[PDB]
A = this chain, B = another copy of it.
Amino acid sequence: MFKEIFTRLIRHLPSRLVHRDPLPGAQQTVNTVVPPSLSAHCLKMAVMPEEELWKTFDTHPEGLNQAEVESAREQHGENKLPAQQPSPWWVHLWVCYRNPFNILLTILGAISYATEDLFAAGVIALMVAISTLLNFIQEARSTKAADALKAMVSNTATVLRVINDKGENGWLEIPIDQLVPGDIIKLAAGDMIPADLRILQARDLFVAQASLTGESLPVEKAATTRQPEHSNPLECDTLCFMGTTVVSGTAQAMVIATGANTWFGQLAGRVSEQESEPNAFQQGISRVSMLLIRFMLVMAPVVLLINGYTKGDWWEAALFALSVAVGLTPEMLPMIVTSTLARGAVKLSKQKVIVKHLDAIQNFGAMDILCTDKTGTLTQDKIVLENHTDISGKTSERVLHSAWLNSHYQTGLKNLLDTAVLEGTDEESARSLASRWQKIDEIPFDFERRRMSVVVAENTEHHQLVCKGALQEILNVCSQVRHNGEIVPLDDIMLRKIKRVTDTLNRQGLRVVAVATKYLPAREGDYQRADESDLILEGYIAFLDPPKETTAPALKALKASGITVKILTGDSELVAAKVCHEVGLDAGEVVIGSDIETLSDDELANLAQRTTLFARLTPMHKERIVTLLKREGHVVGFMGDGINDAPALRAADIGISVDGAVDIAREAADIILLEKSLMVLEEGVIEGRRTFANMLKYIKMTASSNFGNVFSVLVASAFLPFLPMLPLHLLIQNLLYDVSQVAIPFDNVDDEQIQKPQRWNPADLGRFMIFFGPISSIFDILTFCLMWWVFHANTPETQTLFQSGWFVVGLLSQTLIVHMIRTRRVPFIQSCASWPLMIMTVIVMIVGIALPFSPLASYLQLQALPLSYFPWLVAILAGYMTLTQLVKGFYSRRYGWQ
């Protein structure tokens, strides 16, 4: 066969509902380090004087007013990527109608009846148009809902703009797509850079550019250049590029590039080539589409040839074969996938689960390994008890005040310890410390040393550096300790005593953060990580972050649903083990991050499968573990809401984040929970399994029934002297079946189907079609024999009695058989269809019965049915239902339902 390139009958869904958005962190590799005239633009913009910067982008310090912002947006486009913009509704309608089969059905309708029989080609074209409108309405509604959902959780930026008719400025939180060039924004800790920026002003601004320049340490970004030569746009200290995060400090900057013109946007990724590699969902949809095309190409030519030879009307035989084939079209797939999944995605939104792209639902129900941190998900993130003590265990007010200085004057992201220390200090002492101490510098947090320092001063003679961090890291750089009010050298005896005391505290679930301080002579230069030396250890703060009340039932439900929860944490091994024990998780033997640095990929992939808790992990370790956990066909989900969780979120088969996360965590995620809870995640997983099961059932039943109709036509058309059913009748039958099937997205799903992670095999559809097609053909042939002999529709002159006689059987059975094949159990007593499906089935059956008796029947070439036919019809339908119910068991035994 092959000839896959020749087949262009498949219409792919737009690559925003499916497939992930490009995240600007596609490694440090670049296409010849960007092209000229783009690097030159950045290099000129970096050192351009601030005075003439205002004229270049038509910007004023006040900001931008409305008419100006629409003018800038029109001139420079919108702050998006080429693939994130929706096509106009008329283009969507046209691309739905120009389907290579909707066209032929209209042309063959024109050709067959053009000479001397009009109103028959027109009605066929009208049926084609009605089917096209139904498909287009379903897809348009579902894409509108999906696009609304994706825009519900979108990274925002704080801009000046101009609010109030008066013309006053403000600070609006607007979606990052609305940023036009020459716009003024302000940046704080945790905000991702929304576009290429020119730093107007900034204090202690550190940005994590690891995505672009590949360096983990945050880089200071100044208002004016303080480095001698630039020679490179990516390292100029006065421009911030899109896709990088702000670690600490504050800034106010100007947007210079936007959308495609952004560094990452053009020639450093995204714009280069396209989405060459499709994900699992797109591959499965393509496989199903190719299977349907193969079925049609095998069957329809034979149906054409048989009737052409038998009846000598090729222009009508071809139309008849195409009309029976259109039931097996691939164009159902865009309508089924979009309508069924977007129904789930909306329903998940009422469960505090926002789905950014539709295909993620497949992973969300298929996930069997869930990697997450212990803080916030297992623990409460609010610490109830805290003790600030010195090395001797006595409570110390100096430790609390030293920690308060660091917590108050740090500009990084807020922490639970920071919140506790700011709340744990009384108002009077806090006011005295604030008035008596002023900030001079800040050395932010990085994982190489795992500390955080703040340099303050009470005068202009000496400065005090106060750094707080995990106990060892602090003890590594401490040379003296403050014991009993005296500064005494920190010998090894005190080292081992402190270590064992803090290990005893850790085994109780208490996290310990040590605090160190130093006095230095006043200096003008910036402080650097080398200044964290010969410190004086003031003491440590031991605090308890208790586990959530709902963590244990959520973990039990997750395990009952087939999901293996794995804890990836950068905290201590003892605290993590205690937390795991308290919530009911089995920590087993713990694996620290230092252990896996010397392991091979095979060794680590084999170890991670039997290891539940990983401790002392750097973000690189988390990403590597998540990557190697997909080794044996597992679908891995990573849940994280941190600055450095973007690679881990992007590397997992599904990334889950929280509405309160940092900007880069929400950008890289596929699912956004409105509250950080494992129970919400479990219920969402259970509900997404239902959505995927409903989608599969939709495709499965439609394809099987339509294959049965095509087989019925193929086997019995040769013996008849006329078409078993007029193609107009077949088009009406398919349209009325689709109207009924509209309510399948709202069906009920057995708890048996969604009890374990779902595995989707597109080749199973062919087996289901082959098994459940001829069952319909048996009763179709029985109906043919009924109308031939019992009702004497033996000649073409009385063909209309035959054809209509099949029509009501064709539509009613195909509509009824849904309630038999939708479940593996016995219907109407064990598993029952949802009320919308019941109502739609009843309505479509009534319409199909009443159509031959309606005034339209003459126009549709349908003849009224004698009353002696209805008992036969009921017998046929009941026999078909009973036979399929009795035969379902064999399919269950040999292959299985799920």
For A300-313 the 0/1 string (1 means CB < 8 A from B) is: 00000000000000
Most chain B beta-carbon contacts within 10 A, residue among A384, A387, A548: A384
Neighbouring B residues of A508 by C-beta, 8 Å: 385, 387
Neighbouring B residues of A384 by C-beta, 8 Å: 509, 544, 546-547, 582
Neighbouring B residues of A548 by C-beta, 8 Å: 549
CB of A385 within 8 A of CB of B510, answer: yes
Neighbouring B residues of A549 by C-beta, 8 Å: 380, 548-550
CA of A510 to CA of B547 in the docked complex: distance in angstroms?
17
Within 8 A of B (CB), among A574-624: 582
Within 8 A of B (CB), among A494-532: 508-510
Within 8 A of B (CB), among A286-300: none
CA of A402 to CA of B477 in the docked complex: distance in angstroms?
44
CA of A508 to CA of B508 in the docked complex: distance in angstroms?
16
Neighbouring B residues of A510 by C-beta, 8 Å: 385
A544's partner among B380, B544, B550, B582 (CB-CB below 8 A) is B544
Number of chain A residues whose Cβ lies closer than 8 Å to a Cβ of chain B = 14
CB of B550 within 8 A of CB of A385, answer: no
For A540-552 the 0/1 string (1 means CB < 8 A from B) is: 0000101111100
CA of A546 to CA of B387 in the docked complex: distance in angstroms?
16
Q: With both chains docked as a complex, state the minimum distance between the C-beta of A817 and any C-beta of chain B, in angstroms.
A: 30
Please name the residue on chain B nearest to A508 by beta carbon. B385
Within 8 A of B (CB), among A355-414: 380, 384-385, 387
Please name the residue on chain B nearest to A550 by beta carbon. B549
Q: With both chains docked as a complex, state the minimum distance between the C-beta of A369 and any C-beta of chain B, in angstroms.
A: 26
Neighbouring B residues of A582 by C-beta, 8 Å: 384
Within 8 A of B (CB), among A470-508: 508
CA of A549 to CA of B376 in the docked complex: distance in angstroms?
11
Q: With both chains docked as a complex, state the minimum distance between the C-beta of A678 and any C-beta of chain B, in angstroms.
A: 12
Neighbouring B residues of A509 by C-beta, 8 Å: 384-385
Please name the residue on chain B nearest to A546 by beta carbon. B546
CA of A547 to CA of B385 in the docked complex: distance in angstroms?
11
Please name the residue on chain B nearest to A579 by beta carbon. B384
CA of A380 to CA of B546 in the docked complex: distance in angstroms?
10
CA of A384 to CA of B583 in the docked complex: distance in angstroms?
10
CA of A582 to CA of B508 in the docked complex: distance in angstroms?
21
Q: With both chains docked as a complex, state the minimum distance between the C-beta of A585 and any C-beta of chain B, in angstroms.
A: 15
CA of A133 to CA of B828 in the docked complex: distance in angstroms?
30
Q: With both chains docked as a complex, state the minimum distance between the C-beta of A676 and any C-beta of chain B, in angstroms.
A: 11
Q: With both chains docked as a complex, state the minimum distance between the C-beta of A395 and any C-beta of chain B, in angstroms.
A: 8
Q: A385-B385, A385-B509, A385-B544 are in contact. List 6 more A-B contacts (CB 8 A).
A: A380-B546, A384-B582, A385-B508, A387-B508, A544-B544, A548-B549
For this complex, 19 residue pairs linking A to B, each with C-beta atoms less than 8 Å apart, are A380-B546, A380-B549, A384-B509, A384-B544, A384-B546, A384-B547, A384-B582, A385-B385, A385-B509, A385-B510, A385-B544, A387-B508, A544-B544, A544-B546, A546-B546, A548-B549, A549-B549, A549-B550, A550-B550
In the A-B complex, the 3 residue pairs with the smallest Cβ-Cβ separation, listed nearest first, are A546-B546, A384-B546, A548-B549
